[PDB]
């Protein structure tokens, strides 16, 4: 499958693409303000997902540090990133279809559409200011507005035991952002597609 990473922001991101074990394609790479990358991702590709990462240092090996999505200080990523990170999630190929989403659950740093480029079902968004109007007890000096399981780590925020409710944290991300996950049993958002759907992911696609 082809996903088409998108910046539309006004300040570079460094894209990451990992399924948690693995780098996605070269699971991760600088776009600039305009700039797209398309990586390819393995048929049957299992709770894969795709991110931004902002403020990041490289050196020439490809080692440094980003405010934002740091995934173990590699450019090229091969596991997930240091919330707060806006998540396009998705399985491709589960039983005859593919499932996507975009999830709050490990915070929010950088807007983002999640849409099919191929026929058959709807794309998802989250694109509203979440950084900007972040509860105090949330936000992430480095940039972003944390989760509450990362920032209070309790068995309700985090959903420990697989029983949790809605908090007032997650009703913020919710209010925000209806079509994304903003609590471990969020009521799903979850859209399926036709089995080897293709995507594109859009950073900042309001601006
Ligand atoms: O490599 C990591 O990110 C790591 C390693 C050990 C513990 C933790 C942790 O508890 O977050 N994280
Ligand atoms: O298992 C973990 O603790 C973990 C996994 C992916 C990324 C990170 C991280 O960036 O801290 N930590
Ligand atoms: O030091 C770490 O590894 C760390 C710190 C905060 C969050 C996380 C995480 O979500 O894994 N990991
Ligand atoms: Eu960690």
Do not use: H
Request: overall charge positive; some cysteine; glycine content about 12%.
């Amino acid at each position: 499958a082809t996903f088409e990473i998108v910046n539309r922001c006004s300040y570079t991101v460094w894209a990451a693409a990992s399924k948690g074990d693995a780098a996605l394609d070269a699971g991760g790479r600088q776009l600039n303000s305009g700039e797209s990358w398309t990586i390819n991702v393995e048929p049957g590709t299992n709770g894969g997902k795709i991110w931004a990462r902002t403020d990041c240092y490289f050196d020439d090996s490809g080692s440094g540090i980003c405010k934002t999505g740091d995934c173990g200080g590699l450019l090229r990523c091969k596991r997930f990133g240091r919330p707060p990170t806006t998540l396009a999630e998705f399985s491709l190929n589960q039983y005859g279809k593919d499932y996507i989403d975009i999830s709050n659950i490990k915070g929010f740093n950088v807007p983002m559409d999640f849409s099919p480029t191929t026929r058959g079902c709807r794309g998802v968004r989250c694109a509203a200011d979440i950084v900007g109007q972040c509860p105090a007890k949330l936000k992430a000096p480095g940039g972003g507005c944390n989760d509450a399981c990362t920032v209070f780590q309790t068995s309700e925020y985090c959903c420990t035991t697989g029983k949790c409710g809605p908090t007032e944290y997650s009703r913020f991300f919710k209010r925000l952002c209806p079509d994304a996950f903003s609590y471990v049993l969020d009521k799903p958002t979850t859209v399926t597609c036709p089995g080897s759907s293709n995507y594109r992911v859009t950073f900042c696609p309001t601006a």
